[PDB]
Write a protein that binds this ligand. Structure first.
Ligand code: HEM
Ligand SMILES: [C-]#N
Length: 149
């Protein structure tokens, strides 16, 4: 499972390899996959949607699915994960951008951080359900997201 504390053991070449092949298709169909992830997130975690002003009034899966607002936002989420994927070998680059995102989330949007690991789990389920390699990358992501709190 995905954790947002402690430290993560380094990825092995096998992990890196599978993360990359599983990520590919999700990224290339971002306009579709991105929406799916958000719909899934908000229907199972309704508390979380309140932290999103732009999505006020979208009360159904169908409404979420068809809102352009959700689509544009979702692409920014995919692009950020994609940045992490692309940077697995360069801890200094990876970290830098995530630390930045962390600061924005705590001081700018002021979100409750308990949800980072919940969203990250919807992403892992979408990309490759139960893959241990993918869950580690997602855990590194969550740790870093919590860094500015
Ligand atoms: C996997 C974890 C997540 C990633 C990769 C992520 C990524 C992002 C990105 C890339 C942005 C845009 C930053 C910018 O405009 O410069 C953003 C904004 C935002 N995020 Fe996250 N996020 C994550 C989790 C969450 C969660 C769980 C919440 C709610 C609890 C949240 C709430 C927000 C809000 C409210 C905004 C601003 C929306 C707006 O007004 O445009 N994020 N996020
Ligand atoms: C931010 N989702």
């Amino acid at each position: 499972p995905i954790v947002d504390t402690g430290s993560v053991a380094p990825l092995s070449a096998a992990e890196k390899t599978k993360i990359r092949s599983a990520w590919a298709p999700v990224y290339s169909t971002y306009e579709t996959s991105g929406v799916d992830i958000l719909v899934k997130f908000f229907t199972s975690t309704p508390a979380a949607q309140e932290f999103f002003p732009k999505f006020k009034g979208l009360t159904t899966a169908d409404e979420l699915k068809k809102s352009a607002d959700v689509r544009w936002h979702a692409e920014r989420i995919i692009n950020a994960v994609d940045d992490a994927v692309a940077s697995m070998d360069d801890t200094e680059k990876m970290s830098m951008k995530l630390r930045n995102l962390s600061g924005k989330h705590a001081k700018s949007f002021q979100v409750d951080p308990e949800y980072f690991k919940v969203l990250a789990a919807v992403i892992a389920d979408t990309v490759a359900a139960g893959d241990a390699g993918f869950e580690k990358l997602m855990s590194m992501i969550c740790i870093l997201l919590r860094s500015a709190y």
